[PDB]
Amino acid sequence: ACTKNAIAQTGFNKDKYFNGDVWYVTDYLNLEPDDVPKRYCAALAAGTASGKLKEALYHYDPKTQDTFYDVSELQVESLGKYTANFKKVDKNGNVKVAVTAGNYYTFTVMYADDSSALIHTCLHKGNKDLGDLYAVLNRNKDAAAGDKVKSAVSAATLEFSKFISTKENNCAYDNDSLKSLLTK
């Protein structure tokens, strides 16, 4: 179960965050033990497509090779806080699992600048018991977390030392698919 009401960044700049470009997860913190593997790869694109606020996701388990993409229209709860009903798609946007009630994630941007961000997400998917997940993002897939975002982790009363890095997993991403999925 999720337990955190994450606070969105004061003065969050939505148009800059949702500019159509890609964000890579560089580090993550799952609050519930064993909710996720200790080696993982994830990235997203975020943008407005034909007037609609969208995110495209990519997940890859570098050990098992499990791979999946998603696309969602985000609904607004407040500035920087969204609810996203997701559909599983192949890389070309063909639907594998349709949107359905009870399949949604929340998404809160706690900190962002042009190059880095800190987000919280809570996944709801059928009768799974999933918990809070924080992620440090960067525009550059190889970037070590800088002082702005690490200070934001501290300001959220979290310990960056607990976050797990994705950088040692040989992660390679299809940025073209993520961008094009925004339209799907």
Contact 139, 24 (CB under 8 A): yes
Amino acid making up residue 123: L
CA atoms within 13 A on the CB side of 155: 15
Nearer to ligand [N+], 120 or 150 (CB): 120
Nearer to ligand [N+], 49 or 123 (CB): 123
Q: Which does 2 bind (CB under 5 to 8 A by kind): ligand HEM, ligand [N+], none?
A: none
By CB under 6 A, is residue 123 in contact with ligand [N+]? Answer: yes
Amino acid making up residue 8: A
By CB under 6 A, is residue 133 in contact with ligand [N+]? Answer: yes
Amino acid making up residue 85: N
Alpha-carbon distance values, 97 to 80, 93, 163 (Å): 27, 11, 31
Q: Which does 25 bind (CB under 5 to 8 A by kind): ligand [N+], ligand HEM, none?
A: ligand HEM
By CB under 6 A, is residue 179 in contact with ligand HEM? Answer: no
Residues near ligand [N+] (CB under 6 A) are 123, 133
